[PDB]
Structures are given as C-alpha cells and as structure tokens.
Paper text:
We next decided to investigate the structure and detailed interactions of the N76D mutation. As observed for JGFN4 WT, we obtained monomeric and dimeric forms of JGFN4 N76D when it was expressed in E. coli. Both species yielded crystals in the presence of fentanyl, and the structures were determined at 1.60 and 1.85-Å resolution. As expected, crystals obtained with the dimeric form showed a domain-swapped dimer with the trans conformation of CDR3 and fentanyl bound to each protomer. A comparison of the electrostatic surface potential for JGFN4 WT and JGFN4 N76D bound to fentanyl showed that the binding pocket of JGFN4 WT was narrower and less negatively charged compared to the strong negative charge in JGFN4 N76D. It was found that the substituted D76 side chain forms a hydrogen bond not only with the tertiary amine nitrogen of the piperidine moiety but also with the side chain of T28 from CDR1. While a structural comparison between the fentanyl-bound JGFN4 WT dimer and fentanyl-free JGFN4 WT monomer was instructive, having the monomeric and dimeric JGFN4 N76D structures both in complex with fentanyl allows for a more direct comparison to understand how the JGFN4 dimerization benefits fentanyl binding. A superposition of the two structures shows that the N-phenylpropanamide moiety of fentanyl is more tightly surrounded by protein residues in the dimer. N32 is positioned closer to fentanyl due to its interaction with L100 in the extended trans conformation (e.g., N32 Cα to the carbonyl oxygen atom of fentanyl is 1.2 Å closer) in the dimer. We reason that the flexibility of glycine residues in the unique CDR3 sequence of JGFN4 (98GVLG101) promotes switching to the trans conformation, which helps to shape a tighter binding pocket for fentanyl through its interaction with CDR1 residues including N32. JGFN4 N76D was able to still form a domain-swapped dimer and we were able to crystalize it in both monomeric and dimeric forms in complex with fentanyl.
Author numbering:
A (entry chain B), B (entry chain A): 1 to 113
Amino acid sequence: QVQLVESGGGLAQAGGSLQLSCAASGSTSRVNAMGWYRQTPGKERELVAAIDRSGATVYSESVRGRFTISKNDAKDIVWLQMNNLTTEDTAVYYCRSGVLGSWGLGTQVTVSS
Amino acid sequence: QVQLVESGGGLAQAGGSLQLSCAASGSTSRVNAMGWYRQTPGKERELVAAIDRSGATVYSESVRGRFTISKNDAKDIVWLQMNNLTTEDTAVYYCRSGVLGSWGLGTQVTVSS
Ligand SMILES: CCC(=O)N(c1ccccc1)C1CCN(CCc2ccccc2)CC1
Ligand SMILES: CCC(=O)N(c1ccccc1)C1CCN(CCc2ccccc2)CC1
C-alpha cells in the first residue's frame, strides 16, 4: 500500500533541463528500490533510471550521461534530473517502487590468468 | 517464502564464457523482477543485470554487451550468460527476486523546438 506522486512536468525547451520529483508515502520502510520510467508517444513504457537503498544507480542507454537519479531518504523523495533534453524525451514520466527480496546462496566465479 | 538456488559458477579462462542459472521456488507468483549481483572480495555486492516480467532488461556499465540475462517463466528460472570473462569478474554471483509495485499517475514532459 505505497502511494507515489510525480511532479515537475511541464513544457521544456530543447537542450534545457528539468527536475522531476516522486514523493512516496504510506508503508515505505520495505521499499528499497525506486525507478523512473517513461512512455513516449506511440511506444511502450520503458525504464529510464533506478536507484536502490545502497545508492547504486543504473540508467538506460537512451539517457545515460544525461539523466541523474537521486533520493532524499529523509523525506522519501526520488529525483530525476534531466539534462540536454530533446524532442525525443517528450513522454509521460512515471515513478515506481520496488521491494527487493531475499538472495540465493550464491555461486563462485573464478577467472584465471 | 521464496527460495533461490544459483548454479553454474566455476573456473573459466579469460575470454571464456559461463552460464549461471537461478531456480526460484515457493510463492513466486508475485515476483515480477529478478536480478543478478556480484560480490567481489572485499567489496559490496553490486547489481550486474536485472529483468522484469515484461522482458525489459538493464545491465551495469561493466558488463553491457558481454552478459545477457534471460528467463524461463515456465520453470521460474533465470539465466545469466556471461561472455568475454576477465579476471575482474571473479566474485560470488547472487540471484535476487523483487516485487515491483503499481504506478503513479505520472507527470507529462513536453520538449519544444
Ligand atoms: C531507494 C529507496 C529507499 O530505500 N527509500 C526511498 C523510498 C522512496 C523514495 C525515496 C527513498 C527509503 C524508504 C524508507 N524511507 C524511510 C521512511 C521511514 C522513516 C521512519 C520510520 C519508518 C520509515 C527511507 C528511504
Ligand atoms: C521476471 C520474473 C518473473 O516474472 N517471474 C520469474 C521469477 C523467477 C524466475 C523466472 C521468472 C515469474 C514468477 C512466476 N512464474 C509463474 C508460475 C509458475 C510457478 C511455478 C513454476 C513455473 C511457473 C512466472 C515467472
């Protein structure tokens, strides 16, 4: 029962920058990953950037180097800094929560020489 | 109550390839994301690749083009095809399940000119 509210959208000029926010409320203590997605006109919704509780980030090829995902843990807010915008960035941007669960026992990989 | 068992690790020479598998059992119907992590000696466990129930994948920069994550939904098994191994890939590799939640209403971004 986690609630997500995205803000910061609007009209932006090409090459400019925007900052999107996603405010999470409800039972957020279990949420240890957050993701930003976008649905560009005519296309499928796609992951753009994600961040987990350790602070690790990962980005899609289409935004890598341009977008930055960050978080304010004290207020349960995730931010998507979008730079160097083009018309190809026009989309509805969506925030999503994740509860990452248990791990396996693992398997050793050793690479020689 | 989800159990994960990784297999397929071993000794490989540089430039070789490995195929890891992760068998999930238990109450898996809610699990709609799976990730592979690695923990090299002395460092934090780190995301290598993840896949969700719609087939979307994301990879860390260090493995993109070398590793492929895939899934057999019929058997609740995920695979990590590891190609072009280097000595820096030596680690314990872990599988991990995740439940990604609902979406917000989203926020529209329109980029002009
Ligand atoms: C990568 C995400 C992550 O791990 N989080 C997160 C989630 C959404 C948006 C921004 C960040 C945490 C979720 C839990 N909040 C704690 C809230 C709290 C405070 C006091 C008592 C009980 C609960 C810390 C941040
Ligand atoms: C991307 C992850 C994902 O969506 N899952 C998944 C989880 C782990 C590993 C591979 C996939 C689904 C979990 C539920 N199973 C469904 C039903 C079932 C039950 C028992 C045996 C076989 C099938 C479909 C796949």
